[PDB]
Design a protein around this ligand. Sequence first.
Ligand SMILES: CC(=O)N[C@@H]1[C@@H](O)[C@H](O[C@@H]2O[C@H](CO)[C@@H](O[C@@H]3O[C@H](CO)[C@@H](O)[C@H](O)[C@H]3NC(C)=O)[C@H](O)[C@H]2NC(C)=O)[C@@H](CO)O[C@H]1O
Ligand SMILES: [Cl-]
Ligand SMILES: [Cl-]
Ligand SMILES: [Cl-]
Length: 129
Amino acid sequence: KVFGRCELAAAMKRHGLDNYRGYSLGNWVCAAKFESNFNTQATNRNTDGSTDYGILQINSRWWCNDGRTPGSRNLCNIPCSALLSSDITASVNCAKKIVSDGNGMNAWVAWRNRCKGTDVQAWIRGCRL
Ligand SMILES: CC(=O)N[C@@H]1[C@@H](O)[C@H](O[C@@H]2O[C@H](CO)[C@@H](O[C@@H]3O[C@H](CO)[C@@H](O)[C@H](O)[C@H]3NC(C)=O)[C@H](O)[C@H]2NC(C)=O)[C@@H](CO)O[C@H]1O
Ligand SMILES: [Cl-]
Ligand SMILES: [Cl-]
Ligand SMILES: [Cl-]
């Protein structure tokens, strides 16, 4: 599923991401835009052998199990393929764990390099939320 911008904003807000760990909704929408282009099916391999999965590009070295990432944790206790569903529930629940783990949203490289410090409220412009 390729979410619309406001469509994703509303789903993220319903699941309690708006202001989760102090990160406003626009931060999460911006992160998803630059991580996955709003595409729940997005997958990208990393140089360390791990892969990033789904709308928020959750990594198989720490957070989900894909069976092919040696010496990896599965801290969200979920198969990585479950993070590709059109329903974002599993990605959101896992993202809540990630953002609580110490570094905040700096866990998302695209957030750090493209959203952090910018006018993220623009990502929810026009949305009825
Ligand atoms: C969205 C996503 O999957 N992002 C991935 C990052 O999570 C990952 O970065 C590493 O994440 C781990 C787990 O959060 C970091 O470990 C934590 O580090 C802090 C101190 O900085 C400490 O308080 C925590 O206890 C510790 N958690 C543990 C050990 O479970 C680790 O520092 C991150 N590493 C780096 C280089 O940022 C990166 C890299 O694997 O991948 C993203 O896709
Ligand atoms: Cl915002
Ligand atoms: Cl891939
Ligand atoms: Cl923080």
